[PDB]
Design a protein around this nucleic acid. Structure first.
Lengths: 138, 97, 30, 225
RNA sequence: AGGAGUGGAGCCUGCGGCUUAAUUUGACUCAACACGGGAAACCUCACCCGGCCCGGACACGGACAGGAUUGACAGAUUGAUAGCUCUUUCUCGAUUCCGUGGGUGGUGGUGCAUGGCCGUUCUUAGUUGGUGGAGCGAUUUGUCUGGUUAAUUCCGAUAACGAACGAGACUCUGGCAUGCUAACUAGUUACGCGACCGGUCGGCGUAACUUCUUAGAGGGACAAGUGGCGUUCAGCCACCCGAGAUUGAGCAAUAACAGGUCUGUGAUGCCCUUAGAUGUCCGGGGCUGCACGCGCGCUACACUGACUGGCUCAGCGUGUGCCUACCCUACGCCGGCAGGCGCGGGUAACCCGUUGAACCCCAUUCGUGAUGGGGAUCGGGGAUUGCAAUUAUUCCCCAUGAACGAGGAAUUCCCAGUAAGUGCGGGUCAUAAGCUUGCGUUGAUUAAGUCCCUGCCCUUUGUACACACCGCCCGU
């Protein structure tokens, strides 16, 4: 089923297909325990063990990713996982524990549900960068 | 112009087939865009136009490095005289009007 | 040529007196 | 033989600019004021708005036959398959280049600058226009460059609406003392439904419609049919 | 408070003077010095030149009708295969040749003669009527003590009231469309294609829904909600929801300059230019010079690291074509280096492309050095667009480790996806970037303040200035 509601950061995005499966989370043919930077795995296991590894009781989540930058994909892959968990937990099951885990991860941080609207600004001529300008000649 | 008179009259005939065309501003162009492969040097095309400018019966509206020919009734009369031909050869565009 | 205009432009020039006279001619007399 | 969209559109722009320049330098005396191009299947039509239509057409249309005879030999139009049209300009107060060329051929004839500028000013504000700026720079007399302005009525000087509510024309005058540069900027009043000014209202202004009256009986009543 | 730090180190179009005639230009206060969209065999040429040709044509008078060109195996040599004062005389017939004239030449000198043109005070917040009040009047008030604001933005005081241009507003947008028109140049899931008793493929499984990229309409964010300040107002500061509680830029006033451009222009003013024509047909040198001063910038001085290579993530774009070969560019053979032929892929989200890319993801000698930070300093060779790479200019292979131990005084630039690090793209373009213009990618403690020593001249004030201090002026 496709209850995917984006989950984004910068120009990279993730779509978290969710179904009633095995409880194994897959990221485009590779497990979330093994990602190319080899450094942000804790950033990926943060949501699940923050809310509880016991929650996944036969739910197969495959996230497909596309965009620029690896770390830019992260903070959205995990956002997509949290969105898929929210959609699953809103579709049928109760809300009291949903609100409990939501409060816990909201006090944990804010980049698990709501995307960062930030983006790279254009560069203005007459300088090397958007805000930096060349040196003054005396 | 170290150029034969028969070719000048040929240029006059080819112009008389119409009323006005345009010229490319260049003296190094071997041929003519309208008279392609007819042994008509572009520099001599502007030579002809500058000669009739000296006469005072033709003008130009030069634009974007392109001469824009003109022709007044006295000039058409002179060209139809030097061609030694009847004035019956009116521009074919009125036959396609 | 409108003498009001001529006075407006040339009042401070060498012909200021002349344009003043022409303006006065136009203003009153008909 | 197909060509990319960017290149074909830039070629169309080049072609239009070429026509604009050629017809502005060719028919300025005859009051040429604008060229527009339309396309029908295997046919190109060109309509030329002009202040002096009797002077842009000519006797029996012969000049047009001449005109198409010129263009057809420049831009690649095959003989006999192109026609030229002309419409009188609805008002000379909605286009700046018309009054620009008028100023050119009023000063080229020999005329004090101020007289022509004020004649244009009164012509424009008897046309219902909401503002006219004629800036003339050069050497009016003597050997010094003084820029004079002939400013009449209010005129917007910034923002987006300058795209449409203001129409501008730059021109040069070639006298025997030198060159006089003019800019004519004509503001278009608000004329929706009628093509004199822009259809859209001025974006920064608000108008409140008059109130709708009340009828409030103190004793309730019903209206059966 | 602080941040690449250019300044400190050898390599740049050009600067300012700098070996044998041409290394020459325009721009001396930023707002000229990587600027004129500027790395030049040729047209990169504004420049002694060696001169190949009149592209001097034509009113009026000609020895007036025999002036010349297309003469190339030649001895004819200063363009020889253009008879070059060449003994002999070869070539489309009055058409190049004779005079004050007129221009195909005006990138020749003055932008201190001018014109659109932008720099520029100005990207600040300034500017001006009407009616009313004051003054004989020029003028003044409005346009202000003050609070507020990014703002002459408002509030407030108020002989002013009401307005206008500018600011604001506008528009594209950055940012939520889970709602909606809807793709076969877009894309994940109903049955086997090569594997595991149910899980996993960009050769993809029959089946296919707009969630996942483009581009449409409408919506949404308003200091709207609460709290603390405030002349209790305009507003300011905190807080919950929310995608978003300052996304970035182009438009930008009245009026003006003696700021640069006549070397941008078929827009132009007496002088050299009257054909003895500062390139013009052909084209063989020139801004392509060496002693040094803080002109934008370049790779570094190292162990947060260059370095065997493992894994793998980009976004604007640019792309086969009018005197336009040359543009990207999927395989076989060869060739480390560039490249030969073919079946094809591309007018284009169909073709490269899933820009597999590129920075980083740290398993290799590395340890404080002249070797591996630091190709910055040698001679040879394959060769593709280039008749013409002479300063291997530009496509690489070997050897060359000079200097730099993060660099004085004066001192650029920087508040959020910013500075900064990082590569790809467009401009120039034989295929070309140390420059510039866009794009992504990675990505802060920098303080939410004051006017110092920097400018901007707003108010009060003085004036003998008004050509306005580069003024005026006194005396020997």
């Amino acid at each position: 089923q496709s209850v995917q509601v984006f989950g984004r950061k910068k120009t990279a995005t993730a779509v978290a297909h969710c179904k009633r499966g095995n409880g194994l989370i897959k990221v485009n043919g590779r497990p979330l325990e093994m990602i190319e930077p080899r450094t942000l795995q804790y950033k990926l296991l943060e949501p699940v063990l923050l809310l509880g590894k016991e929650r996944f009781a036969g739910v197969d989540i495959r996230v497909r990713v596309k965009g620029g930058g690896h770390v830019a994909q992260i903070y959205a892959i995990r956002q997509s996982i949290s969105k898929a968990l929210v959609a699953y937990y809103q579709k049928y099951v109760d809300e009291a524990s949903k609100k409990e885990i939501k409060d816990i991860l909201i006090q944990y941080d804010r980049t698990l549900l709501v995307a960062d609207p930030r983006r790279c600004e254009s560069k203005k001529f007459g300088g090397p960068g958007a805000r930096a300008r060349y040196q003054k000649s005396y | 112009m170290l150029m034969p008179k028969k070719n000048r009259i040929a240029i006059y005939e080819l112009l008389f087939k119409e009323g006005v065309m345009v010229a490319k501003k260049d003296v190094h162009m071997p041929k003519h865009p309208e008279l392609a492969d007819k042994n008509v040097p572009n520099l001599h095309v502007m030579k002809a136009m500058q000669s009739l400018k000296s006469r005072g019966y033709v003008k130009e509206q030069f634009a974007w490095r392109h001469f824009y020919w003109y022709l007044t009734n006295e000039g058409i009369q002179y060209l139809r005289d030097y061609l030694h031909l009847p004035p019956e050869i009116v521009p074919a565009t009125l036959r396609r009007s | 040529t409108d003498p009001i205009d001529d006075f407006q432009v040339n009042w401070n020039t060498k012909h200021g007196s002349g344009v003043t006279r022409e303006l006065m001619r136009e203003l009153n007399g008909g | 033989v197909q060509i990319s969209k960017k290149r074909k559109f830039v070629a169309d722009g080049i072609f239009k600019a070429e026509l604009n320049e050629f017809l502005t330098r060719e028919l300025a005396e005859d009051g040429y004021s604008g060229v527009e191009v339309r396309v029908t299947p295997t046919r190109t039509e060109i309509i030329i708005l002009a202040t002096r239509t009797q002077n842009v057409l000519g006797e029996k249309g012969r000049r047009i036959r001449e005109l198409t005879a010129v263009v057809q030999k420049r831009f690649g139009f095959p003989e006999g398959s192109v026609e030229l049209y002309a419409e009188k300009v609805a008002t000379r107060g909605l286009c700046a280049i018309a009054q620009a060329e008028s100023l050119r051929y009023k000063l080229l004839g020999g005329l004090a600058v101020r007289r022509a500028c004020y004649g244009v000013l009164r012509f424009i504000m008897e046309s219902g226009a909401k503002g006219c700026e004629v800036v003339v720079s050069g050497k009016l007399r003597g050997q010094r460059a003084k820029s004079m302005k002939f400013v009449d009525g209010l005129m917007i000087h910034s923002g987006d609406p300058v795209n449409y509510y203001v129409d501008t024309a730059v021109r040069h005058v070639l006298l025997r003392q030198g060159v006089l540069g003019i800019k004519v900027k004509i503001m278009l009043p608000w004329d929706p439904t009628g093509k004199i000014g822009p259809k859209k209202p001025l974006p920064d202004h608000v108008s409140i419609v008059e109130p709708k009256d009340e009828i409030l009986p103190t004793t309730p009543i019903s209206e059966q049919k």
